Design a protein around this ligand. Sequence first.
Ligand SMILES: CCC1=C(C)/C(=C/C2=NC(=C\c3[nH]c(/C=C4\NC(=O)[C@H](C)[C@H]4CC)c(C)c3CCC(=O)O)/C(CCC(=O)O)=C2C)NC1=O
Ligand SMILES: CCC1=C(C)/C(=C/C2=NC(=C\c3[nH]c(/C=C4\NC(=O)[C@H](C)[C@H]4CC)c(C)c3CCC(=O)O)/C(CCC(=O)O)=C2C)NC1=O
Ligand SMILES: CCC1=C(C)/C(=C/C2=NC(=C\c3[nH]c(/C=C4\NC(=O)[C@H](C)[C@H]4CC)c(C)c3CCC(=O)O)/C(CCC(=O)O)=C2C)NC1=O
Ligand SMILES: CCC1=C(C)/C(=C/C2=NC(=C\c3[nH]c(/C=C4\NC(=O)[C@H](C)[C@H]4CC)c(C)c3CCC(=O)O)/C(CCC(=O)O)=C2C)NC1=O
Ligand SMILES: CCC1=C(C)/C(=C/C2=NC(=C\c3[nH]c(/C=C4\NC(=O)[C@H](C)[C@H]4CC)c(C)c3CCC(=O)O)/C(CCC(=O)O)=C2C)NC1=O
Ligand SMILES: CCC1=C(C)/C(=C/C2=NC(=C\c3[nH]c(/C=C4\NC(=O)[C@H](C)[C@H]4CC)c(C)c3CCC(=O)O)/C(CCC(=O)O)=C2C)NC1=O
Ligand SMILES: CCC1=C(C)/C(=C/C2=NC(=C\c3[nH]c(/C=C4\NC(=O)[C@H](C)[C@H]4CC)c(C)c3CCC(=O)O)/C(CCC(=O)O)=C2C)NC1=O
Ligand SMILES: CCC1=C(C)/C(=C/C2=NC(=C\c3[nH]c(/C=C4\NC(=O)[C@H](C)[C@H]4CC)c(C)c3CCC(=O)O)/C(CCC(=O)O)=C2C)NC1=O
Ligand SMILES: CCC1=C(C)/C(=C/C2=NC(=C\c3[nH]c(/C=C4\NC(=O)[C@H](C)[C@H]4CC)c(C)c3CCC(=O)O)/C(CCC(=O)O)=C2C)NC1=O
Ligand SMILES: CCC1=C(C)/C(=C/C2=NC(=C\c3[nH]c(/C=C4\NC(=O)[C@H](C)[C@H]4CC)c(C)c3CCC(=O)O)/C(CCC(=O)O)=C2C)NC1=O
Lengths: 172, 172, 172, 172, 162, 162, 162, 162, 242
Amino acid sequence: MQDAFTKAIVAADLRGSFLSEQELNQLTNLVKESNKRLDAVNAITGNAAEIISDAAHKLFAEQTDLIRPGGNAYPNRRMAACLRDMEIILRYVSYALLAGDASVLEDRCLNGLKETYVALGTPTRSVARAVQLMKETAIGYVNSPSGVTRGDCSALVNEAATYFDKAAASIA
Amino acid sequence: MQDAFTKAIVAADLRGSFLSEQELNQLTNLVKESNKRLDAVNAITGNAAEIISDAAHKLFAEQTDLIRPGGNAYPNRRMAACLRDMEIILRYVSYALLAGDASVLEDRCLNGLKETYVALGTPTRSVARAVQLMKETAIGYVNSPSGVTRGDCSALVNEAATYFDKAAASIA
Amino acid sequence: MQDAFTKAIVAADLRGSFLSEQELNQLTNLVKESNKRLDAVNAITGNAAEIISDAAHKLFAEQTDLIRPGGNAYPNRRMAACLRDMEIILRYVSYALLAGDASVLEDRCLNGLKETYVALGTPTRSVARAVQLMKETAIGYVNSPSGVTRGDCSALVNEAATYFDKAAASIA
Amino acid sequence: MQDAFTKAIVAADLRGSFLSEQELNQLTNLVKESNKRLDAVNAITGNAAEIISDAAHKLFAEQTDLIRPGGNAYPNRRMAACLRDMEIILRYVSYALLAGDASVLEDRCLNGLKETYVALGTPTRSVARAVQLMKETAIGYVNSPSGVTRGDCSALVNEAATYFDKAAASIA
Amino acid sequence: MKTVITEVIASADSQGRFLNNTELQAANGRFQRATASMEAARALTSNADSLVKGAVQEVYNKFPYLTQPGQMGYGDTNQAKCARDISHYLRFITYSLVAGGTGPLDDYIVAGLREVNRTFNLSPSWYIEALKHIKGKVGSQLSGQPLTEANAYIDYCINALS
Amino acid sequence: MKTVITEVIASADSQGRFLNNTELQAANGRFQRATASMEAARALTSNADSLVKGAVQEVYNKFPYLTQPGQMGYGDTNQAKCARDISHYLRFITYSLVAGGTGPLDDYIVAGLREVNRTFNLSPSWYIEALKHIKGKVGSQLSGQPLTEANAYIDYCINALS
Amino acid sequence: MKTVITEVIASADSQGRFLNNTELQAANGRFQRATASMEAARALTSNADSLVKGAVQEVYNKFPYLTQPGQMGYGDTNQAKCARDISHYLRFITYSLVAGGTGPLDDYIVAGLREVNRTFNLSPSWYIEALKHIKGKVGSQLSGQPLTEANAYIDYCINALS
Amino acid sequence: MKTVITEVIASADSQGRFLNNTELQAANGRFQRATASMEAARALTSNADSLVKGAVQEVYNKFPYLTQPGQMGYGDTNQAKCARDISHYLRFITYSLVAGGTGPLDDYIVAGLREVNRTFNLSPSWYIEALKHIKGKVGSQLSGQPLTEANAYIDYCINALS
Amino acid sequence: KRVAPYAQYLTPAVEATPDAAAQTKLGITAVAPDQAVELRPNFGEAEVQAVIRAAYKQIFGNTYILEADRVVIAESLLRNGSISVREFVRLLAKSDLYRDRFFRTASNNRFIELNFKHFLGRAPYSQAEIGEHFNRYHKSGYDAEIDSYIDSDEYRRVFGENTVPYFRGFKYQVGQAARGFDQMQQLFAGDAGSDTDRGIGAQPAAKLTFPLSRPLGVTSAYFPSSQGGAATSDGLEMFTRM
Ligand SMILES: CCC1=C(C)/C(=C/C2=NC(=C\c3[nH]c(/C=C4\NC(=O)[C@H](C)[C@H]4CC)c(C)c3CCC(=O)O)/C(CCC(=O)O)=C2C)NC1=O
Ligand SMILES: CCC1=C(C)/C(=C/C2=NC(=C\c3[nH]c(/C=C4\NC(=O)[C@H](C)[C@H]4CC)c(C)c3CCC(=O)O)/C(CCC(=O)O)=C2C)NC1=O
Ligand SMILES: CCC1=C(C)/C(=C/C2=NC(=C\c3[nH]c(/C=C4\NC(=O)[C@H](C)[C@H]4CC)c(C)c3CCC(=O)O)/C(CCC(=O)O)=C2C)NC1=O
Ligand SMILES: CCC1=C(C)/C(=C/C2=NC(=C\c3[nH]c(/C=C4\NC(=O)[C@H](C)[C@H]4CC)c(C)c3CCC(=O)O)/C(CCC(=O)O)=C2C)NC1=O
Ligand SMILES: CCC1=C(C)/C(=C/C2=NC(=C\c3[nH]c(/C=C4\NC(=O)[C@H](C)[C@H]4CC)c(C)c3CCC(=O)O)/C(CCC(=O)O)=C2C)NC1=O
Ligand SMILES: CCC1=C(C)/C(=C/C2=NC(=C\c3[nH]c(/C=C4\NC(=O)[C@H](C)[C@H]4CC)c(C)c3CCC(=O)O)/C(CCC(=O)O)=C2C)NC1=O
Ligand SMILES: CCC1=C(C)/C(=C/C2=NC(=C\c3[nH]c(/C=C4\NC(=O)[C@H](C)[C@H]4CC)c(C)c3CCC(=O)O)/C(CCC(=O)O)=C2C)NC1=O
Ligand SMILES: CCC1=C(C)/C(=C/C2=NC(=C\c3[nH]c(/C=C4\NC(=O)[C@H](C)[C@H]4CC)c(C)c3CCC(=O)O)/C(CCC(=O)O)=C2C)NC1=O
Ligand SMILES: CCC1=C(C)/C(=C/C2=NC(=C\c3[nH]c(/C=C4\NC(=O)[C@H](C)[C@H]4CC)c(C)c3CCC(=O)O)/C(CCC(=O)O)=C2C)NC1=O
Ligand SMILES: CCC1=C(C)/C(=C/C2=NC(=C\c3[nH]c(/C=C4\NC(=O)[C@H](C)[C@H]4CC)c(C)c3CCC(=O)O)/C(CCC(=O)O)=C2C)NC1=O
């Protein structure tokens, strides 16, 4: 598994080199913003259930076919499979936010995720949408939390978004 | 698993008849040369480590790219894997040599091996070469050993070579 | 598994109570001395091999009986087992030292150990001694290390000793 | 308790039968050799002290660790216990020899003995050896005594040996 | 019981390995963070009970039918067992604060929670609402990293109940 | 690749729980520690050239016979491959410093070490002595927690080789 | 196919080691033994025709009723398939003799024997009696270690059928 | 899908075995029982409309507050999704009646029930009370073994929700 | 004393790669895999969860095992300590969820592939290997068939009584046939990929039948090559050496 430092190290090694002063300071900056990062990961963990629930309510509000017989979130067994899914992805996204690298997401989750769904008959476009809704709400929470020091988290909100967007793209 | 006798038996059975005095005497000759065969297998066993080591030293002497970063015998983990594969192949070649038949070599070792290496990014041409070097040194030992009775081992040296050459061909 | 805090918590809970101001400050002190504790655990980790080696050299200096056929550290297989056990015990002592509680040592290492050795015919008094020697050298290292800030580590040296002494007592 | 006749009787009874002419004559032969048997038991009784003493001298000649501090035949108390056990075992071997059956030896001496010694920390291999030495000397005496009529006692010497060997095997 | 210390030790042990610089760096985090944690702990410790009576009542005010006769917020014994239960939660929150991990919560409240609540007809909604209220008031007893810690664990309980 | 960050994530994943406050401090340790680590890294990085030549020579000064003909410290190629190898070690030490764990050392030097050294007739003693020397000189390039970090990883390599 | 060489090679492969002495020593046995084995093989090979007709008949002489109408020793096809079957056994005996092990017998006659015989209403007793007879006559075609070899394998079939 | 027929077949298959008198006796039970089951099924089928409206209302009458604004028994969509859900239960009850086992209930309502209800803030108590009411009225639509069957499955759902 | 220049040796390196093979292959990195969630003495709660969470993923082929279906008693015995990891496994394999998910709707061939994956972490090395298992099913039935994996020399030698089974197909194991490696890739779909039948319900036709039987192949004749670079010929080689 990689994190943002480990990634630097692998690229340096492929040159046969000690880390460039370029790469060093990029990583010094990641340490600089790490308290914000911890709050951002904490924002997701602290609202995981609601993020999944709210995404869910809204997914089925839009796509009332999934909860009809014939639909891929019917009966209870399938809904439970779907609702757990949302939570995993939200949880996976927040690991990446702290690692500062998408690899755990791509390798352990998205890795193989598209394939399954087509074999199963699970509508990937609906799954992509559920991921887009988790993103909206998750970032909502990253941006408006309990008594965190005021500052600018937009860099981290972007990065979190790209993890949500990776997953969506990979699946649709 | 087959040996040279077992092979005879399978071909006889497919005719639904007994030994064709032809096949009997071919096998009587294998028994005739079996002391030499035991010395030949013993030559390899008794120098396995040096055969691998010497092949290795020479492989990396020729292909200094493998031991650079980016190279398939770098870092220590990969070199140990490469040294291990050299041993595995030398092992199954010695088994074939005791057996008088290539099948154990082809069935357990060579079958699928090329496609493994390609999946891994392991340069098959370099692996083929490492096998060619093991052959040179192994046969060296088969031909010039400790106080073995003097005679002609060229038939066995050829046969050993074809096992080394099978492996090389199969992999490159 | 317990650490020094977890232990406090279990005792508090058995009263049905929030932690006593008594217990709170005992734990505040643990946090106060924690940099020293980290150096102490680091002293052992950084010299594990030598601590085992030096204990060993000295154990067999004293007790040649084990080194001779009939002895419990003969032949190579048994010596490797004995060297391995020295490492295992030093390892759980270091864990206890990071934790501020003996429980991991007692539960995962010492529990049943004496009866194992007696079943095996392993002389427990010799094992106890090997533990006493590890203690001498380990503490040596805790007390005289590379450019650590000067101060008083005797409280921690005592506590480490009691873990070595627990193990010795439990085994002899 | 069994003797050689009693053993016959128990096996006959388990068939519901009067003793077989087979078994009758086996027992007639035991009566035939009984004077020799009495001399053989007498050989042991008449030299019990020396048999134990000589076994002992030789045991500690070989295993000088037992008489060092830390050793299982140190101090006087333990040596007296060890000398006592040598006598006890020699005693039950002589009983078996009068009886023509091992049962008294197995039932009132050997049963549980190994587990006793292990509980005590008494080295069973040393005890086995002390028994082997008693055997050598005891048989010595059975074979070369004071003005007994000349004849062949090898059958009885074997049987005595198996009693010594039972004990050794049972204990080691 | 999950703490930073037990976690790194568990990870070392399971690879048959002495603690190394990775694991000791981790431990330093837990020790460096003790001051904020323990300040939160002391504040939550001394300002305690009323939180329970406040949350108990709020369960009845939000579910009025609760405090009516024939209901589970009626009579001394229900209302007594409620205060007790919220008190259990706050107690384990303080323990988790002091311990440096969720262990006390995981072992004494989370393991088995749903089975128990389901057999006894206890709705999680009450407990979430007790905790949401406790979270509102703890906004003005603490601030900075002690508040973040208090929040972390209160929220952890709310997610355990959803 | 073992870092504090990857370790806690691995433990969550294998356990399926959101990164929560017990874990966050582990991570905070690694981030709080970065300054000392990275100072050690910069000092080891710019002195690399001389640290390597110093240790290479010390291998010959401690094992004089290595530099005689027919030996493995003789001729340009042996002496070249030696400098390179110590340079590999210092490189991975800096990586381990920067990464917040032993991962780079574990994956690129420790995994397979003995098999390789045994096939190629390379004695660990040389490498330990190279590292003991590097440890002596790093005593005056750094101090405080950067030195402790440098030491942690140098010692880690020496234990890997014993 | 189970034989001396094959077995030792398999052992080596499983152990992932090297053809050492134990193995070589074991293999020599198989080679040293080939002469007696192969003499038995040649004698059984050229007498096959009559050994088969002798044993076939003996099955009818020992089980007279088999040759009456409505029975399984009656008509050209039963009596033909019988000769064939004994011929299969002698064939695999010669193969086992030449191969240096029971492999050919294990793989081509023993594996599955009872299931087949049970579905087709074939009594092992016939086959044992065919083999007992073949064993009687092979007493005067061979002697010494070739006879011992022939016997080893005939008996192996009798035990396999039992 | 669990029925008497599938169960006995599963048990045979898993022992590699033809259906025997044990398994066919079992099947006869399921077939003998079909008449009572299917009478219950027809009665529950034609009364479905009113059984559903009766139970839906009873959920509001037993939990009056549900029908106030801001609550989950308010507005067309909640009240619509409720009727639907009870209708799902009655539907699977009839299926279980017709099928000769709990399979349809196990596969389409029980598997996953709690996870779903917990994510969506649906209290089992409502559903139990819907079913308790349906059980009251089915007392006078059926009697004898059809009633026992209807009861068996209604009670099965109530236990699934406790 | 100055250095014989050595910077030529570190150029590029040639076409160079950087511990890529596992990642390019995809998923191999996750599964070039750290040993299982072993059980120690005095195991605490943390330890039991790792073994239990881990075991399910590993033996149920990564299919989502929902909260509503845990095998409540498998784990109880494992916690109270009566049984090992090895008999914890043997009790999950004969459970309904294992039975239901893989045996019931797969042919035999297909069903046999998954036990090699779930139980020994490798692909069947040979065509014969499927023969033996299928046959044992025919005489001994289903339960005996499962027993054979767990209770076998290969499983026992490697997973002891306390380790949990893990993918080992991607590394050379002594005695495996050459085709173990590529075959394992068909079996493994990457970390998201799960071995489950929900899409059809039936589950797929066995993947390895055609892969299992691909032939030897005889690039025969074959004339070797000395080029390469120019290689010495002459008699002088020994002599110079002498
Ligand atoms: C237990 C693990 C852990 C956490 C969670 C942690 C958080 C943490 N967040 C901090 C700051 C902060 N955190 C934020 C975060 C935000 N600002 C906003 O306006 C956004 C809504 C939000 C975006 C994510 C900001 C702006 C600061 C102050 C600037 C800084 O220190 O970087 C600080 C510095 C002290 C302070 O200023 O309060 C800490 C210690 N430390 C830890 O050890
Ligand atoms: C422990 C297993 C085992 C071994 C290894 C074994 C070896 C063995 N090698 C032998 C002969 C021999 N071995 C060789 C071998 C060679 N000649 C050469 O010049 C080459 C360098 C080498 C080629 C391989 C030769 C030429 C003979 C004599 C001819 C013969 O017996 O076939 C003999 C016959 C006795 C003798 O003449 O010394 C034995 C017993 N026997 C065994 O039971
Ligand atoms: C990577 C994990 C990690 C470690 C190892 C760590 C060590 C560490 N040890 C420290 C102090 C110290 N460490 C010691 C230790 C000792 N004094 C002696 O004379 C004895 C030989 C030795 C006994 C163990 C002392 C006396 C201090 C200064 C007092 C204190 O800070 O408590 C400090 C405070 C800064 C300083 O004064 O240097 C740190 C950060 N911090 C970490 O995050
Ligand atoms: C007080 C109890 C008691 C004893 C001890 C006893 C001994 C005894 N031993 C005897 C014979 C004998 N005893 C032996 C014994 C031996 N021959 C050897 O060369 C060996 C050294 C030794 C082996 C044990 C032999 C060979 C005979 C003569 C043959 C025989 O009578 O069976 C005889 C027959 C008379 C004689 O020939 O002297 C008696 C009465 N009788 C008794 O009532
Ligand atoms: C160590 C951690 C721990 C927790 C959290 C815990 C919860 C818990 N609550 C219980 C009962 C209860 N819990 C309540 C709760 C409430 N009643 C009200 O007025 C409110 C609606 C609500 C508070 C918000 C009630 C009324 C009972 C009695 C249930 C019964 O027995 O009928 C019981 C059953 C045993 C008993 O009757 O005491 C348990 C185990 N037990 C524990 O050991
Ligand atoms: C990524 C991490 C990594 C390490 C650590 C590494 C070590 C390493 N050292 C090697 C050789 C070597 N290593 C040395 C070492 C020395 N010679 C001397 O003068 C001194 C005594 C000593 C330095 C202290 C020598 C002489 C060789 C050549 C061995 C040979 O091929 O005969 C080789 C064999 C391949 C080659 O010839 O380059 C490896 C793999 N390789 C790696 O990829
Ligand atoms: C490769 C080794 C091998 C063996 C050993 C073998 C045995 C064998 N014997 C068979 C039949 C038979 N075997 C016999 C045997 C006999 N009939 C008599 O007159 C005698 C009593 C007796 C000879 C002692 C008979 C009568 C049948 C025909 C059974 C039937 O189809 O009804 C069949 C059924 C297929 C067929 O009808 O040919 C098999 C497989 N098959 C094999 O492939
Ligand atoms: C095949 C079997 C099956 C069942 C049993 C089932 C239950 C079920 N009920 C749901 C929602 C719901 N269920 C209700 C239930 C009620 N509201 C009220 O007025 C009453 C209090 C109560 C009826 C007693 C409500 C209000 C919702 C909407 C929840 C939401 O999305 O906020 C949902 C979420 C998807 C959706 O919004 O439709 C499921 C899956 N789904 C199934 O596929
Ligand atoms: C590596 C981490 C990981 C992921 C991501 C994963 C996905 C995954 N989702 C699955 C099923 C499923 N996934 C869903 C999801 C949905 N249904 C919908 O209609 C929505 C569009 C969507 C929810 C947003 C459903 C309904 C199934 C069950 C399909 C069936 O069995 O019919 C399955 C089959 C096994 C099972 O049912 O447990 C896998 C492997 N598995 C994993 O181990
Ligand atoms: C059946 C007997 C058998 C064989 C033959 C076998 C080959 C084999 N070689 C492998 C890797 C490897 N093989 C090599 C070999 C080489 N690298 C080079 O640059 C050289 C050209 C060559 C040495 C001469 C390397 C470096 C790897 C590791 C690839 C990686 O992980 O990046 C792997 C992947 C699993 C692992 O790394 O353990 C297999 C299965 N496995 C087996 O079980």
